[PDB]
Design an enzyme around this catalytic site. Sequence first.
Site, PDB file in Angstrom:
ATOM      1  N   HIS A  61     -43.200 -25.645   9.579  1.00  0.00           N
ATOM      2  CA  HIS A  61     -42.173 -24.908   9.570  1.00  0.00           C
ATOM      3  C   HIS A  61     -42.553 -23.672   8.455  1.00  0.00           C
ATOM      4  CE1 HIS A  61     -39.511 -27.777  11.568  1.00  0.00           C
ATOM      5  NE2 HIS A  61     -40.093 -28.701  10.634  1.00  0.00           N
ATOM      6  N   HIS A  91     -43.624 -23.231  -1.632  1.00  0.00           N
ATOM      7  CA  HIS A  91     -43.933 -22.705  -0.074  1.00  0.00           C
ATOM      8  C   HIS A  91     -43.457 -21.125   0.093  1.00  0.00           C
ATOM      9  CE1 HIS A  91     -39.932 -24.592  -0.090  1.00  0.00           C
ATOM     10  NE2 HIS A  91     -39.601 -23.392   0.608  1.00  0.00           N
ATOM     11  N   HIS A  93     -41.049 -18.305   2.581  1.00  0.00           N
ATOM     12  CA  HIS A  93     -40.299 -18.011   3.996  1.00  0.00           C
ATOM     13  C   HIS A  93     -40.697 -16.253   4.075  1.00  0.00           C
ATOM     14  CE1 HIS A  93     -37.904 -21.435   3.916  1.00  0.00           C
ATOM     15  NE2 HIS A  93     -38.117 -21.464   2.436  1.00  0.00           N
ATOM     16  N   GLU A 103     -34.931 -15.435   2.369  1.00  0.00           N
ATOM     17  CA  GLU A 103     -33.669 -16.038   2.564  1.00  0.00           C
ATOM     18  C   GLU A 103     -32.741 -15.598   1.694  1.00  0.00           C
ATOM     19  OE1 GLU A 103     -35.101 -20.401   2.620  1.00  0.00           O
ATOM     20  OE2 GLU A 103     -35.110 -20.003   4.662  1.00  0.00           O
ATOM     21  N   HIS A 116     -40.604 -20.061  -2.931  1.00  0.00           N
ATOM     22  CA  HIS A 116     -39.818 -21.111  -3.500  1.00  0.00           C
ATOM     23  C   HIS A 116     -40.678 -22.163  -4.224  1.00  0.00           C
ATOM     24  CE1 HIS A 116     -36.463 -20.219  -0.346  1.00  0.00           C
ATOM     25  NE2 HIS A 116     -36.407 -19.568  -1.395  1.00  0.00           N
ATOM     26  N   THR A 195     -32.846 -25.013   2.046  1.00  0.00           N
ATOM     27  CA  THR A 195     -32.374 -23.991   2.788  1.00  0.00           C
ATOM     28  C   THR A 195     -33.038 -24.450   4.303  1.00  0.00           C
ATOM     29  OG1 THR A 195     -34.490 -22.831   2.813  1.00  0.00           O
ATOM     30  CG2 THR A 195     -32.449 -22.296   1.195  1.00  0.00           C
TER      31      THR A 195
HETATM   32  C1  LIG Z   1     -48.262 -34.444  -4.211  1.00  0.00           C
HETATM   33  C2  LIG Z   1     -47.143 -33.889  -3.316  1.00  0.00           C
HETATM   34  C3  LIG Z   1     -46.371 -33.236  -3.909  1.00  0.00           C
HETATM   35  C4  LIG Z   1     -45.287 -32.803  -3.087  1.00  0.00           C
HETATM   36  C5  LIG Z   1     -45.152 -33.370  -1.544  1.00  0.00           C
HETATM   37  N1  LIG Z   1     -43.977 -32.458  -0.970  1.00  0.00           N
HETATM   38  C6  LIG Z   1     -42.606 -32.354  -0.628  1.00  0.00           C
HETATM   39  O1  LIG Z   1     -42.170 -33.443  -1.101  1.00  0.00           O
HETATM   40  N2  LIG Z   1     -42.259 -31.107  -0.075  1.00  0.00           N
HETATM   41  C7  LIG Z   1     -40.994 -31.038   0.516  1.00  0.00           C
HETATM   42  C8  LIG Z   1     -39.636 -31.215   0.023  1.00  0.00           C
HETATM   43  S1  LIG Z   1     -38.361 -31.363   1.384  1.00  0.00           S
HETATM   44  O2  LIG Z   1     -37.249 -32.207   1.342  1.00  0.00           O
HETATM   45  O3  LIG Z   1     -38.869 -32.490   2.457  1.00  0.00           O
HETATM   46  N3  LIG Z   1     -37.871 -30.046   1.929  1.00  0.00           N
HETATM   47  C9  LIG Z   1     -37.452 -28.904   1.235  1.00  0.00           C
HETATM   48  C10 LIG Z   1     -38.005 -28.723   0.023  1.00  0.00           C
HETATM   49  C11 LIG Z   1     -37.449 -27.441  -0.343  1.00  0.00           C
HETATM   50  C12 LIG Z   1     -36.802 -26.720   0.519  1.00  0.00           C
HETATM   51  S2  LIG Z   1     -36.204 -25.175  -0.064  1.00  0.00           S
HETATM   52  N4  LIG Z   1     -36.391 -24.258   1.388  1.00  0.00           N
HETATM   53  O4  LIG Z   1     -34.846 -25.033  -0.142  1.00  0.00           O
HETATM   54  O5  LIG Z   1     -36.776 -24.579  -1.108  1.00  0.00           O
HETATM   55  C13 LIG Z   1     -36.534 -26.960   1.770  1.00  0.00           C
HETATM   56  C14 LIG Z   1     -36.831 -28.202   2.115  1.00  0.00           C
HETATM   57  C15 LIG Z   1     -46.097 -34.156  -1.137  1.00  0.00           C
HETATM   58  C16 LIG Z   1     -46.990 -34.423  -2.061  1.00  0.00           C
HETATM   59 ZN   LIG Z   2     -37.909 -22.702   0.844  1.00  0.00          ZN
END
Ligand SMILES: Cc1ccc(NC(=O)NCCS(=O)(=O)Nc2ccc(S(N)(=O)=O)cc2)cc1
Ligand SMILES: [Zn+2]
EC number: 4.2.1.1
Length: 257
Positions: A61, A91, A93, A103, A116, A195
């Site tokens: 995504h 990341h 968008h 966004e 973000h 989001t």
């Molecule tokens: C060492 C390490 C460090 C991080 C990780 N990664 C994570 O945990 N990543 C993602 C968090 S998430 O829940 O799954 N989803 C998510 C997050 C932000 C947003 S937003 N678009 O609102 O900003 C939307 C969805 C892996 C290894």
């Molecule tokens: Zn995001």
Amino acid sequence: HWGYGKHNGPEHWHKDFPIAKGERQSPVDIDTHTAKYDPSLKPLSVSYDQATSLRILNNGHAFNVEFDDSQDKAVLKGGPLDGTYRLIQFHFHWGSLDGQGSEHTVDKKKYAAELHLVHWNTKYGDFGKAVQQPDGLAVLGIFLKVGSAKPGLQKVVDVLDSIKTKGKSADFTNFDPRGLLPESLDYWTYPGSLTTPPLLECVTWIVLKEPISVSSEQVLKFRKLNFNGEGEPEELMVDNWRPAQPLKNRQIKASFK
Ligand SMILES: Cc1ccc(NC(=O)NCCS(=O)(=O)Nc2ccc(S(N)(=O)=O)cc2)cc1
Ligand SMILES: [Zn+2]
């Protein structure tokens, strides 16, 4: 499962994730004439000197640059925040066209992309606990406009060939995230949500007023990524943004006058 296509896009998400229609969903439009300066807001404290990036991942995504969050190495504090929030990943968008991709919007203006920087509140011990808390996350949002190149983005841009498709990851150590920041840390803030699904209402959003400039060649290389996995039909990873959601019973505060 969910995505940004016409059969699995944002208008479908509520069927699996009913919180999509909730009371503090993100992103939102930032109406600059209705946001109120809040003099009790403290300056943001972005402490990224000891940041330890580890890996860059295409998750189908977007792409995430992941950091070591097992210690206080890269932390966000101050502003509207109580306590210390550790950077876990950033990341973006982005759009298929330069006129869309962010966004959040500012007076209905869409930027080409939005960064973000995702942080979690250390009082909850790990990221998975933090997302279950109303003050669990702090996401620092930074708009991107197309213009001059952003030098500190280029190492990100140059590794994207190696994570073209979903599930590919690449070593990405020693990356320095303050090189993605604008000059000013003036910001808007409001309480919101992730989001993307699961759309959890766990985020203090901090959105910087000043966008950064990236080059046309830089954002073109975002647009060469794929949502799909290797050996599947190629679908370009573009327009991976959720549109603005109703503000409902929320006020957006401004750190600046
Ligand atoms: C060492 C390490 C460090 C991080 C990780 N990664 C994570 O945990 N990543 C993602 C968090 S998430 O829940 O799954 N989803 C998510 C997050 C932000 C947003 S937003 N678009 O609102 O900003 C939307 C969805 C892996 C290894
Ligand atoms: Zn995001």
